[PDB]
Symmetry: C3
Subunit: 32 residues, 3 copies
Amino acid sequence: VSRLEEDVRNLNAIVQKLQERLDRLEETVQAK
Amino acid sequence: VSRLEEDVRNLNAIVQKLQERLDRLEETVQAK
Amino acid sequence: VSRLEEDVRNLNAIVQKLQERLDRLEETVQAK
Ligand SMILES: [Zn+2]
Ligand SMILES: [Zn+2]
Ligand SMILES: [Zn+2]
Ligand SMILES: [Zn+2]
């Protein structure tokens, strides 16, 4: 696994966490 | 294209959408 | 640094900015 492949896998995981965080905040602002 | 090429262009598309959603939510919060 | 490596560098920078924006917006929402 090259450094480039390692970095991409890490980015996939980071972007998944950001998406969940964003989704939660959008719903926190909706305040249903 | 290779898996790495695919993963990188996919990440580019996702982060663009995240940026747009964040832009929108920032504006929404400010306007509330 | 190849093009693919540069795209990954730029994704790293973008995700850092997005994480910061999310942090600030979460704080804004909790404060307001
Ligand atoms: Zn969720
Ligand atoms: Zn949701
Ligand atoms: Zn939900
Ligand atoms: Zn694709």
